[PDB]
Design a protein around this ligand. Structure first.
Ligand SMILES: CC(C)=CCC/C(C)=C/CC/C(C)=C/COP(=O)(O)OP(=O)(O)O
Lengths: 228, 228
């Protein structure tokens, strides 16, 4: 009630944090961000949040220097393997397109996520190779494919698309929409993250870069959410 | 001046403003809010903003009391008739479904908007009977119907949908996406307003209720945007 069912987190500021700290290698920032993802998910679970979505890799991110992108993707893969650790008993789902990150990372991520239970008290979505407008397009495509496979005419395809039909074909099919979306780094935008799903979400902003995010920042987010 | 090309405004807090100011009849908030809409649009025009979208009526707002809704719809009709006054020489477009507001108001709104020039220095979108997810669905339907008209087979329709195709079939077809979205009354959500189009918009919030929104606040918004 006063607590979000589903919290979504956009983890901005990793490179800026590394520069501010005087590191020449921005992977120091991503590594600390990775540590904070692990912490944040523990906080959500213990607070009684049912589902958390973390934005690990956007389609924008994939346009980066090959070598920096490679190291980032390795960090992300370690993050997901950590999220999927058996002792957590968290149910994990990928949100996005693993066809974009390389086959070795994709195999590692898929394997980790597939090892987690379907039914659990806490669920984690890891958004990797994700874009919100793209997700909608792919939802519509999936919807139309199913209708065609079940014998729809071209004319019937034209009318088959509905709000509920799109919702049911997103990556987040069958999950509650995010109640609270957290963005860091003073960035006051959505950047298409869970675009369809977050239409009615509460937004909460901090100036802190993601690697600098603290448990008390999480407490403030929940406090503010409850107050609203 | 780094001005937004397109500013979108969610005019929240009208009834809360009225109650706080000791008005027993909260419809009065809508009348003060209507006066402020005209003034905001003047400020936008004078500042050199090319396009402004104002949120006048959501599909959800139609769930209100008949007396309150009746007043609100008449007030909205007045607002639009003012926006469309020939002395303004503003180009106006309806964003939403006028079939949701009743035949007689719909007739008046359409007449007013149709009377405005296609070409002008300042453009205003009036969002009436609008929902963001519905807009996307209707854009996809429009897109598919056009492909079918051009002779596409059902097999071909399944893969006809693209990001660009959806954008070109929204109410805002041919317009730039919003650069800045303003919401009042301390409300930190988008409520599906220009859902697709505002994926990458800057969000700006004030605690001021809409009827209390002043030019100094507008300048703050532009200052904060320029500083993003
Ligand atoms: C003349 C004048 C001042 C007209 C404006 C009056 C009016 C109805 C403003 C509402 C704008 C708005 C923020 C809608 C979104 O609320 P929502 O109910 O659709 O969604 P929500 O529940 O998340 O807020």
């Amino acid at each position: 009630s006063d607590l979000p069912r589903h919290i979504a987190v956009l983890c901005d500021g990793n490179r800026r944090w590394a520069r501010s700290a005087g590191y020449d290698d921005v992977s120091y920032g991503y590594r600390m961000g990775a540590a904070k993802i692990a912490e944040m998910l523990r906080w959500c679970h213990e607070a009684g949040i049912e589902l958390a979505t973390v934005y690990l890799l956007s389609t924008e991110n994939l346009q980066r220097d090959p070598d920096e992108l490679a190291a980032l993707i390795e960090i992300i893969t370690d993050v997901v393997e950590e999220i999927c650790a058996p002792a957590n008993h968290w149910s994990v789902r990928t949100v996005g397109d693993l066809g974009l990150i390389g086959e070795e990372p994709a195999r590692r991520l898929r394997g980790a996520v597939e090892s987690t239970p379907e039914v659990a008290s806490f669920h984690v979505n890891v958004a990797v190779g994700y874009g919100g407008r793209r997700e909608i397009v792919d939802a519509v495509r999936a919807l139309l494919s199913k209708e065609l496979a079940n014998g729809a005419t071209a004319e019937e395809l034209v009318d088959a698309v509905t709000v509920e039909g799109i919702s049911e074909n997103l990556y987040t099919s069958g999950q509650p929409d995010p109640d609270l979306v957290i963005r860091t780094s003073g960035e006051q935008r959505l950047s298409g993250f869970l675009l369809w799903q977050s239409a009615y979400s509460e937004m909460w902003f901090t100036e802190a870069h993601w690697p600098a995010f603290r448990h008390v920042d999480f407490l403030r987010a929940l406090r503010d959410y409850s107050a609203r």
